[PDB]
Amino acid sequence: DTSTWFITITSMIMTLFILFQLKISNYSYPASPESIELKTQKHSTPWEMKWTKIYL
Amino acid sequence: VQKLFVDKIREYRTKRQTSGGPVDAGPEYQQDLDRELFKLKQMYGKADMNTFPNFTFEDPKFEAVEKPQS
């Protein structure tokens, strides 16, 4: 109850923070998916500008 | 009036017999038509009596420019 002596649990808590940093590290953010559509637009526009400079 | 007519024909033939040209004109008709033609030739043009004209002309130099495309 008023328990005692403490040599227990606290060494078994930091092994747990090797688990939770393994699972939650492999998550996906919805926002990152909206960023890859932006750089694809500017690249072909500059490639068309490279084709416009191939005209001009 | 034929006898008056041949009297005119006589005086035309004595006007045909000339050796000094204008007998009644004198310097009056000589200074007039010499100054009249030179006043008209100044409006006409300075051209000689036998000099045939010949010349050449220069055409424009067809130049070019630069324009970088493709």
| Residues in chain A closer than 8 A to B70 (CB atoms) | 54-56
Kindly state the tokens that stand for B18. Answer: 């000339």
Determine contact: A53 vs chain B, CB below 8 A.
no
Kindly state the tokens that stand for B52. Answer: 């045939």
Q: Rounded to 5 degrees, what angle do the CA atoms B6, B11, B16 make?
A: 120
Three-state DSSP class for residue B9: helix
Site of tokens 């328990």: A3
Instruction: List the single residue in A with minimal CA-CA distance to B69.
Output: A56
| Residues in chain A closer than 8 A to B69 (CB atoms) | 55-56
CA distance to A36, A49, B46, per residue, from A44 (Å)? 13, 8, 76
How many whole angstroms separate alpha carbon B69 and alpha carbon A54? Answer: 7
Domain count, chain B: 1
Three-state DSSP class for residue A33: helix
Can you say how many angstroms the Cα of residue B6 is from the centroid of all Cα atoms in its chain? Answer: 37
- Position A17: which residue type? F
The residues near B69 (Cβ < 8 Å, ≥ 6 apart) are A55, A56
User: Domain range for residue B17?
Assistant: 1-70
Determine contact: B70 vs chain A, CB below 8 A.
yes
Q: Please report, to the nearest 10 degrees, the dihedral formed by the alpha carbons of residues A38, A41, A43, A48 taken in order.
A: -160
Q: Give the phi and the psi of residue B55 in degrees, each rounded to 5.
A: -160, 180
Maximum CA extent, chain B: 105
Determine contact: B51 vs chain A, CB below 8 A.
no
Chain B neighbours among A 17-46 (CB < 8 Å)?
none
Breaks (C-N over 2.5 A) in chain B follow: none
Q: Rounded to 5 degrees, what angle do the CA atoms A15, A19, A20 make?
A: 115
Resolution in A: 3.5
Structure determined via: cryo-EM
